[PDB]
């Protein structure tokens, strides 16, 4: 049971009607954000509109990135989501800005149906070209089947008498091991012989599995599942990421839409997250204006807790949020508040009901107390060491005294600070 | 099919001429090399042309 | 002939084979016993570590395209390559262990 | 086809123009810009004509002015068989490539070339396929009866036709297209002839189709290329393969040289014609004074199509250099260049404008709602408008009324911040955010 | 019949004794320089002396691309003319010193002239048994035919050759062209004489060759030193495992060693001193070389005194500049002083009212268009007022405004609308300076 | 003899004019003047071919145009063959696919030669006839022939073997390996030379040898360390001295290859020879390459190194001090310095006529006092450029002398570098500034 920082934020807890109460869905206050938030949620349920921008920005300990969770959780597991860091975007395999592009392309989901076709059954002769013979728990069928995974089977040391499980549209060869009908063959025989199968030699399933366009893209450029020789021994020679061409995208764009016209697929629109924008250089930002504006882009999400500063890559423009204005124009803003001491406290004891963990209510207010004075962070961080240290003491609760021992033991920002201001030797 | 139509006249053999020598390196030695380049350039050959 | 390939390239300039055989020469005649298990090749290590890759190798492609993994190394029933070179990469190939 | 949901441009479609190239005030989803639609369409008859190349073209003014939406625009009148090649400035600085290759691949994409290959294909119906073996008395044994609408005729094989037939397992009773000059079966569907043995086919061939009656045809094949196809074919042993991953790697410049005279020796000869594609990049003043320097020289060539650029900031410092020049462009390049300029929008044109985006967008408004966007639009920008009307559609069936009114238009305009009102509160709020030099004030209290 | 500010420079237009007239070659004014890059194709087409340098001073606007593009015309499509510009030096893949030495080779070319012996249906073919050996089987002789047209001929040789014929997969009948120097033979198709042998059938018709059963043909071949290094340091071959790793390699250019060029060197000295083949120098032009760097130039200098360098052009507009790479040193043309003391310096001056004009006239004769004379000698007003090129470039829409209204001719107000409609780069800044809205 | 140039920027340079106590000469092989410094790079040279002492740093100093690569060309002309004279640039050093410091080394190891000595015996174009037999292990023994000497040779199931691969009718000559190695084929015969209608390319009719066959030849084998490194470097890497492609070797063939040429030297079948590595334009480098230069001085096996420059008290590269003569005081401490004045009135003279003559130039009298005018004016180099245009001028001219005019005439088409500079200054607003300021508005 694993808890770090996060999963006690269960959604945004909006109502049908579109107005959040105080306290619910492990959220409490930022009323108006988590409103916006909610409409966002709508909007990209809408399924609609695309290469839309929103931004939220405010101070640490605001929650952006817990509310960021909040949105994706909400949206639930059908819509595609990737979160992002912005110094990931820097490669050395890759330009940055087709990393980006490669980023955009995971972000939309594609629900596709297909008929898996397979043979499966006892292994009777092999007759060379090759021709296979196949019996079943009733059945029995002859295959002819190309010599590639002919060879395959020779190279999976395939005996007489075996069982083994073909998938007809891959190609793919997985021998499940040998009959039973002649299993005690030898006395210690390391081979697992195993039952027939039942039923036909031929079978027909459906699957309704989901991929993105990011990978289709590279299932296309690069082949990565061979199985005989020359296919793993081409694909061995280029293990290095390379770039996609934009014919290759336009391609891939053409495929699907037919397959959706058709009528087999359906398009599942997405949201990409890049959390701590303010660090992006200026070349990705200004191309962030061009892949916006597009018809396929996914809407996007920034953070940045920043104010009149100058982005990275210029020396000269100072512009709120690190962001130039540029991108500015085509982006909507969500401003976050600052908490206050009772919503500390509820915090902080969500957090420690979260936690498991039983507090006295002085303690509480010691911890309420304690964070409005450096920060909420500080005590979420030191409330475990509490329990711990009470926990020495072979008791469940928390006591005062133990919380000022443990604040005793572990310092702050402020206090570290203070301690090398005046420091013998910058300690 | 638009390109390469014209290697039936312009061609020109850069190995004819000996001019991919890199390639023939591991075969061969000088005792036999001057000799006949000598011997085949005069004497072997003033009583065939 | 005579004045173009007679002997032409047998005058060294770059290099001989002789040479060659004679720099790389070996004045070793047995050392390193022990390539048993102080080197342990890598063809020994991938066996000797059989039972981990079968209980750990699990992921698997979400897409794949067929007859790409053919013609990545450029042989297809409609290929630049020749007629008996194809087939003779993988029976050089095949034999491989 | 074009599988899109909904672009920031889906309403500019081709210009508006008349044969007088006279701009019409509302024509084909966009208003306004006169002086500038008219400038644009004396280039796209330029490009039309096809006899100018190596002219450059430089749309300036203020940032959200119709620019991005000028270069939709023309690139959709261009219509197809005119290569249009959109680039930003940021797509060049790639690691694999050097800038000016970037740019050489980029000025080879923006060339069309079309060419006409004559085969002679014969179709039809087949009924079965006769594949014999070798015998005494001659190679094989085959008749090929194939039928169609009007006529059916017979065919015997070519030795190799046995083995194209038997690379795949043909069905009899297809309609099958050969060209003897290349020998290529196109199993385009199955023998329409009767249905009533083929209506359950299961989907397959496509509705699989009528025959056409007579078989000995020769129709020309018209394919368009551009020049960076042919060179990175000619690169490599495979270089289509290359051309769909992008792993050219330099092309060598004999090649392009030899490329260049092969081509005009068709062009002289009549087997190919030249298309003058179109190159445009956006926000130039991102590039660098060697690209600068490059494409000085590179537009002169006479395979050098139109190029138009477009930026947004004036008299700034070009990237390379400490100086702030003029237009952020370097000064020669600002005198072989052609500059547009685009005007500051009027409340009318940008009402009529959301509008648009109103009607394209499904969204169903009203007029005090229309007055009171057009007003926020006057006031920040188009664009904060232009996203407010799309966000206020949620808001307007989250109460169940299909159509928006002011009371959802002022609730997301107190929902979303304005750049103006955002920036009034960070200064108001200094201490709250991060500070340039790291001067954060996380405590509340104290 | 497209044109891109050039294409109507034929030549330098210089007459016998070095003299050169007003209007000629589609070029006007500035005759110093024309004699003087005239003096310079003269010592070119010495072939002589090699391994000088040029550099041509100007401001903007002046005619150095046309120069030496009319230089290039001058001297002529056999000797190989490379241009460039200072920025495609920089690559991601090897060296600036090593590409400029790859285009220094390449600046130079070689013209090579050899002699072929080939014989051209196919009558008949029969190997001759025992190998008095180990050897499995073989066979002693093969004896083949060919009919061709001139009369046919019987053909003896070896079955190395129809081991070979026999991997090509070509027909007893069928035609076939067989190379006497090695003994490369490729299918040359399906005659004309089996036509019709089925009813359908797919192989090339492939007329029968009229010519004699051995025909000997000349062939002479222009090449360059720089591709005779790369085709000996790249590999080739079928099957061989080398040959599969190269053709899967994707062969970036890396790094030529000196060695390549001394063999190459050595090589073609002894062919010229035989006397088959004959080098002919070639001029490597640099356009802009303001943007090259402290180590170009520097290596430069290195190449300028090396064996084979040929005879390079160069260019530049900058003043009292400083150099890429340094700050201290200020020097005019942004070229280090070592490297201008290594070569000459050709100026080239303005045009005035009435050459601007000139050229104006010239221009639109080319791109065959009617100017009417007042609207004419307006263009040359606003010509010398902004700039030449801006009324250079102004021509073609004035064009398309009178295809608008259905008159060849180029009138007054037209030009002026046209005028309206673009702006120049002075009108552009002045309202850039004007507004305060990022503009 | 093979002498593929055209001409050389100083090709008149073929060796240094001195005696036998190393006198330098007034005038000799294209080298006039800077006599101390022709006796520095005589005594430099003798060192050389002393072949004793080793790691030994030499600077050449001077003025731009001064000759000082002259000496250096002087003296690799003087060396000759059988010594390797690495000349290099201080340019090529930065390498994006190599560190520096290895380019460094390699160039180390280039400019020192080693030569072996080796002897194999082999009988050449003897295989005639061959007698197949019982049945199995068959032509057990054959004879051999050349033009002038026979004998009968038994074979055995090894040889027969290897007489199986590739078989040949044995009435041709054919050279095979008595040392126990191969078989190589030589050609055919005279017998069978008019047998065939089309040639190929893989045997060629080859003459019988002349005397006996068999026949132990020692070879002498001449290479430097760098490609000695470079093939046991990888399992073949002959490509590398051509494609290029070193790949960093890594510093375990270096100091195993220095055993092992020094058990060759012990054996006395290897013989050293110390070259010359010069590098010009040194003022451009990095300290790190300088840092590693001192240190490389010390080897045992390090070639004479020479350096060549021209700037004074500048900046270097790599640091912010503005260190005298461009290099650092540590390497100017551990190096010997040859400097040289400048050229002279008469040295002029004697140099124009020098290289008026090399170009096979007729020249009066009068235009070469003006020419040693103008070369006292500006640099030497400007009229040893303009001689040239001044004989193609002439030529244009129909007359076969350079006359007076003719070379004013060239002199005002070209513009001198300060006239050019003072030209410039005059018209300012004409060019573009290294603000990006320009004017083309005449108006
Ligand atoms: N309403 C809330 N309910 C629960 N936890 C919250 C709430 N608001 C903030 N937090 C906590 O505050 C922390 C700050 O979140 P995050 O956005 O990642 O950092 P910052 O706010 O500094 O950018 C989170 O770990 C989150 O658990
Ligand atoms: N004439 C017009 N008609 C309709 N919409 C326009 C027009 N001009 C601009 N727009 C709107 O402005 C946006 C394009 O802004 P743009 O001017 O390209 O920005 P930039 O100036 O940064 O290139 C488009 O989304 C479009 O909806
Ligand atoms: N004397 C001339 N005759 C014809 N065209 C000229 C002449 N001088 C300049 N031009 C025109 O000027 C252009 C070349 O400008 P150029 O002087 O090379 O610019 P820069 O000075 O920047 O190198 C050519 O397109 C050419 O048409
Ligand atoms: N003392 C000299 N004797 C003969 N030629 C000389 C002499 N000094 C200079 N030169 C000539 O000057 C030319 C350039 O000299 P160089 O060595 O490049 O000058 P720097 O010392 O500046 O490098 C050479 O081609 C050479 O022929
Ligand atoms: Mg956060
Ligand atoms: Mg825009
Ligand atoms: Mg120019
Ligand atoms: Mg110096």
Same mark, same amino acid.
């Given at each position: 049971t694993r808890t770090a920082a996060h999963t006690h934020i269960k959604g945004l807890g909006?109502?049908?009607?579109?107005?959040?109460?105080?306290?619910?869905?492990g959220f409490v206050g930022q009323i108006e954000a988590r409103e916006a938030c909610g409409v966002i949620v709508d909007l990209i349920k809408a399924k609609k509109m695309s290469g839309?921008?929103?931004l939220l920005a405010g101070g640490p300990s605001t929650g952006k990135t817990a509310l960021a969770l909040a949105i994706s959780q909400e949206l639930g597991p059908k819509v595609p989501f990737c979160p992002l860091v912005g110094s990931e975007l820097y490669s050395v395999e890759v330009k940055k800005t087709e990393t980006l592009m490669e980023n955009f392309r995971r972000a939309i989901g594609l629900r596709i149906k297909e008929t898996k076709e397979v043979y499966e059954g006892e292994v009777t002769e092999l007759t060379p070209e090759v021709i296979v013979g196949l019996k079943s728990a009733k059945g029995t069928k002859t295959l002819r089947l190309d010599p590639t995974i002919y060879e395959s089977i020779q190279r999976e040391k395939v005996s007489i008498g075996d069982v083994i499980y073909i998938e007809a549209n891959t190609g793919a060869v997985k021998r499940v091991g040998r009959s039973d009908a002649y299993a005690t063959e030898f006395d210690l025989e390391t081979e697992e012989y195993v039952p027939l199968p039942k039923g036909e030699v031929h079978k027909k399933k459906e699957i309704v599995q989901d991929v993105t366009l990011h990978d289709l893209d590279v299932a296309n450029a690069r082949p990565q599942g061979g199985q005989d020789v020359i296919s793993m021994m081409?694909?061995?020679?280029?293990?290095?990421?390379?770039?996609?061409?934009?014919?290759?995208?336009?391609?891939?764009?053409?495929?699907?839409?037919?397959?959706?016209?058709?009528?087999?697929?359906?398009?599942?629109?997405?949201?990409?997250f890049i959390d701590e924008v303010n660090m992006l250089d200026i070349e990705i930002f200004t191309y962030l204006n061009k892949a916006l504006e597009s018809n396929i882009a996914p809407v996007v999400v920034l953070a940045s807790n920043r104010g009149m500063t100058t982005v990275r890559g210029t020396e000269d423009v100072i512009s709120?949020?690190?962001?130039?204005?540029?991108?500015?124009?085509?982006?909507?803003?969500?401003?976050?508040?600052?908490?206050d001491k009772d919503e500390i406290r509820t915090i902080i004891e969500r957090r420690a009901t979260v936690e498991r963990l039983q507090v006295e209510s002085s303690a509480l207010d010691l911890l309420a107390t304690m964070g409005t004075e450096t920060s909420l962070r500080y005590a979420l961080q030191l409330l475990a060491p509490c329990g711990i240290l009470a926990?020495?003491?072979n008791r469940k609760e928390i006591v005062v005294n133990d919380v000022n021992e443990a604040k005793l033991l572990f310092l702050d920002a402020k206090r570290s600070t203070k301690i090398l201001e005046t420091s013998a030797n910058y300690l | 099919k638009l390109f390469k139509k014209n290697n039936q006249v312009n061609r020109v053999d850069l190995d004819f001429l000996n001019l991919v020598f890199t390639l023939n390196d591991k075969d061969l030695t000088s005792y036999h090399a001057e000799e006949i380049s000598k011997l085949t350039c005069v004497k072997n050959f003033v009583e065939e042309v | 002939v005579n004045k173009l390939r007679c002997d032409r390239r047998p005058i060294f300039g770059k290099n001989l084979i002789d040479l060659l055989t004679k720099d790389r020469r070996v004045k070793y005649d047995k050392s390193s016993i022990i390539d048993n298990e102080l080197i342990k090749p890598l063809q020994t290590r991938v066996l000797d570590n059989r039972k981990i890759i079968d209980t750990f190798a699990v992921l698997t492609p979400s897409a794949v395209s067929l007859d790409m993994r053919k013609?990545?190394?450029?042989?297809?029933?409609?290929?630049?390559?020749?007629?008996?070179?194809?087939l003779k990469v993988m029976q050089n190939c095949f034999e491989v262990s | 086809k074009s599988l899109s949901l909904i672009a920031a441009h889906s309403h500019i479609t081709g210009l508006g123009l008349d044969e007088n190239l006279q701009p019409r005030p509302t024509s084909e989803g966009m208003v306004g810009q006169l002086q500038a639609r008219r400038a644009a369409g004396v280039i796209l008859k330029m490009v039309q004509n096809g006899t100018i190349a190596g002219?450059?073209?430089?749309?300036?003014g203020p940032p959200s002015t119709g620019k991005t939406a000028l270069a939709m625009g023309v690139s959709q009148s261009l219509g197809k068989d005119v290569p249009f090649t959109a680039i930003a400035g940021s797509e060049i600085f790639s690691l694999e490539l050097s800038k000016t290759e970037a740019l050489t691949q980029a000025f080879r994409k923006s060339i069309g070339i079309k060419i006409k290959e004559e085969t002679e294909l014969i179709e039809?119906?087949?009924?079965?396929?006769?594949?014999?073996?070798?015998?005494?008395?001659?190679? &094989?044994?085959? &008749?090929?009866?194939? &039928?169609?609408t009007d006529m059916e005729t017979i065919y015997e094989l070519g030795n190799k036709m046995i083995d194209g037939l038997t690379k795949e397992k043909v069905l009899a009773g297809d309609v099958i297209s050969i060209d003897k000059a290349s020998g290529k079966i196109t199993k385009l569907g199955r023998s329409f002839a009767r249905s009533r043995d083929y209506d359950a086919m299961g989907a397959d061939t496509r509705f699989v189709q009528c025959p056409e009656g007579e078989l000995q045809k020769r129709k020309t094949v018209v394919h368009t290329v551009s020049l960076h196809e042919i060179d990175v074919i000619n690169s490599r042993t495979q270089g289509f393969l290359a051309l769909f991953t992008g792993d050219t790697g330099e092309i060598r410049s004999e090649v392009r040289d030899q490329i260049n005279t092969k081509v005009a020796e068709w062009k002289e000869e009549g087997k190919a014609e030249i298309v003058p594609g179109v190159l445009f990049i956006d926000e130039v003043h991102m590039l660098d004074i060697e690209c600068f320097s490059f494409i000085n020289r590179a537009l002169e060539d006479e395979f050098a199509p139109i190029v138009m650029m477009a930026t947004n900031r004036g008299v700034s410092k070009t990237r390379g250099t400490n100086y702030k020049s003029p237009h952020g462009l370097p000064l020669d390049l600002l005198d072989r260049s052609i500059i547009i300029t685009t005007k500051s929008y009027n409340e009318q044109e940008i009402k009529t404008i959301l509008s648009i985006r109103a009607q394209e967008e499904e969204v169903e408004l009203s007029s005090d709602a229309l007055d009171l966007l057009t007003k926020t639009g006057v006031e920040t920008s188009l664009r904060y408008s232009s996203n407010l009307i799309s966000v206020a559609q949620q808001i307007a069936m989250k109460r169940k009324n299909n159509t928006v009114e002011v009371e959802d238009v002022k609730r997301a305009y107190l929902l979303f911040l304005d750049s103006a009102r955002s920036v009034k509160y960070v200064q108001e709020n200094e201490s709250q955010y991060i500070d340039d030099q790291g001067n954060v004030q996380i405590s509340i209290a104290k």
């Amino acid at each position: 049971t694993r808890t770090a920082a996060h999963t006690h934020i269960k959604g945004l807890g909006l109502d049908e009607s579109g107005v959040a109460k105080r306290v619910e869905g492990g959220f409490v206050g930022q009323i108006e954000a988590r409103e916006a938030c909610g409409v966002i949620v709508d909007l990209i349920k809408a399924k609609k509109m695309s290469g839309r921008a929103i931004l939220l920005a405010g101070g640490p300990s605001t929650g952006k990135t817990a509310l960021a969770l909040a949105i994706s959780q909400e949206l639930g597991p059908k819509v595609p989501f990737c979160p992002l860091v912005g110094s990931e975007l820097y490669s050395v395999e890759v330009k940055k800005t087709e990393t980006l592009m490669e980023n955009f392309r995971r972000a939309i989901g594609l629900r596709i149906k297909e008929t898996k076709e397979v043979y499966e059954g006892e292994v009777t002769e092999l007759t060379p070209e090759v021709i296979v013979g196949l019996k079943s728990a009733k059945g029995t069928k002859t295959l002819r089947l190309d010599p590639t995974i002919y060879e395959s089977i020779q190279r999976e040391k395939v005996s007489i008498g075996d069982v083994i499980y073909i998938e007809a549209n891959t190609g793919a060869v997985k021998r499940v091991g040998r009959s039973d009908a002649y299993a005690t063959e030898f006395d210690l025989e390391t081979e697992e012989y195993v039952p027939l199968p039942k039923g036909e030699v031929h079978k027909k399933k459906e699957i309704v599995q989901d991929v993105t366009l990011h990978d289709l893209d590279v299932a296309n450029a690069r082949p990565q599942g061979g199985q005989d020789v020359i296919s793993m021994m081409g694909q061995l020679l280029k293990p290095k990421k390379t770039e996609i061409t934009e014919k290759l995208r336009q391609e891939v764009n053409k495929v699907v839409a037919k397959y959706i016209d058709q009528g087999v697929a359906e398009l599942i629109p997405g949201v990409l997250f890049i959390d701590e924008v303010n660090m992006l250089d200026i070349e990705i930002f200004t191309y962030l204006n061009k892949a916006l504006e597009s018809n396929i882009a996914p809407v996007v999400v920034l953070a940045s807790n920043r104010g009149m500063t100058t982005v990275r890559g210029t020396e000269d423009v100072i512009s709120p949020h690190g962001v130039p204005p540029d991108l500015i124009d085509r982006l909507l803003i969500v401003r976050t508040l600052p908490y206050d001491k009772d919503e500390i406290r509820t915090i902080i004891e969500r957090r420690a009901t979260v936690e498991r963990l039983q507090v006295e209510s002085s303690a509480l207010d010691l911890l309420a107390t304690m964070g409005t004075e450096t920060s909420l962070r500080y005590a979420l961080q030191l409330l475990a060491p509490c329990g711990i240290l009470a926990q020495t003491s072979n008791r469940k609760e928390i006591v005062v005294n133990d919380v000022n021992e443990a604040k005793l033991l572990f310092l702050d920002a402020k206090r570290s600070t203070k301690i090398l201001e005046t420091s013998a030797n910058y300690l | 099919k638009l390109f390469k139509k014209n290697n039936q006249v312009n061609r020109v053999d850069l190995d004819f001429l000996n001019l991919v020598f890199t390639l023939n390196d591991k075969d061969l030695t000088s005792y036999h090399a001057e000799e006949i380049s000598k011997l085949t350039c005069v004497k072997n050959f003033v009583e065939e042309v | 002939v005579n004045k173009l390939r007679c002997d032409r390239r047998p005058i060294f300039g770059k290099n001989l084979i002789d040479l060659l055989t004679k720099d790389r020469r070996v004045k070793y005649d047995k050392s390193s016993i022990i390539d048993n298990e102080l080197i342990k090749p890598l063809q020994t290590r991938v066996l000797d570590n059989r039972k981990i890759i079968d209980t750990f190798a699990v992921l698997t492609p979400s897409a794949v395209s067929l007859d790409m993994r053919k013609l990545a190394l450029g042989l297809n029933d409609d290929s630049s390559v020749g007629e008996n070179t194809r087939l003779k990469v993988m029976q050089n190939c095949f034999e491989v262990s | 086809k074009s599988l899109s949901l909904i672009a920031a441009h889906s309403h500019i479609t081709g210009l508006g123009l008349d044969e007088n190239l006279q701009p019409r005030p509302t024509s084909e989803g966009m208003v306004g810009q006169l002086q500038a639609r008219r400038a644009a369409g004396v280039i796209l008859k330029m490009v039309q004509n096809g006899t100018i190349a190596g002219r450059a073209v430089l749309v300036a003014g203020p940032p959200s002015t119709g620019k991005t939406a000028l270069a939709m625009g023309v690139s959709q009148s261009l219509g197809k068989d005119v290569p249009f090649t959109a680039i930003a400035g940021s797509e060049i600085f790639s690691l694999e490539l050097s800038k000016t290759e970037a740019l050489t691949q980029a000025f080879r994409k923006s060339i069309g070339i079309k060419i006409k290959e004559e085969t002679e294909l014969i179709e039809g119906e087949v009924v079965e396929i006769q594949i014999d073996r070798s015998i005494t008395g001659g190679h &094989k044994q085959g &008749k090929l009866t194939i &039928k169609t609408t009007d006529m059916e005729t017979i065919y015997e094989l070519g030795n190799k036709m046995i083995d194209g037939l038997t690379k795949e397992k043909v069905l009899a009773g297809d309609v099958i297209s050969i060209d003897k000059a290349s020998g290529k079966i196109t199993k385009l569907g199955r023998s329409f002839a009767r249905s009533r043995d083929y209506d359950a086919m299961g989907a397959d061939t496509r509705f699989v189709q009528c025959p056409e009656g007579e078989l000995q045809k020769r129709k020309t094949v018209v394919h368009t290329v551009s020049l960076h196809e042919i060179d990175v074919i000619n690169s490599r042993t495979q270089g289509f393969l290359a051309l769909f991953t992008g792993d050219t790697g330099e092309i060598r410049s004999e090649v392009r040289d030899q490329i260049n005279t092969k081509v005009a020796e068709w062009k002289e000869e009549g087997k190919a014609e030249i298309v003058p594609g179109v190159l445009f990049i956006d926000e130039v003043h991102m590039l660098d004074i060697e690209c600068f320097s490059f494409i000085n020289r590179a537009l002169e060539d006479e395979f050098a199509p139109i190029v138009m650029m477009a930026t947004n900031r004036g008299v700034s410092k070009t990237r390379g250099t400490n100086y702030k020049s003029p237009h952020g462009l370097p000064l020669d390049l600002l005198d072989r260049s052609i500059i547009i300029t685009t005007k500051s929008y009027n409340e009318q044109e940008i009402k009529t404008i959301l509008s648009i985006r109103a009607q394209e967008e499904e969204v169903e408004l009203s007029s005090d709602a229309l007055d009171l966007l057009t007003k926020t639009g006057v006031e920040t920008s188009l664009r904060y408008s232009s996203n407010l009307i799309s966000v206020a559609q949620q808001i307007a069936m989250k109460r169940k009324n299909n159509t928006v009114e002011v009371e959802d238009v002022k609730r997301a305009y107190l929902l979303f911040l304005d750049s103006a009102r955002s920036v009034k509160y960070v200064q108001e709020n200094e201490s709250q955010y991060i500070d340039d030099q790291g001067n954060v004030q996380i405590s509340i209290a104290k």
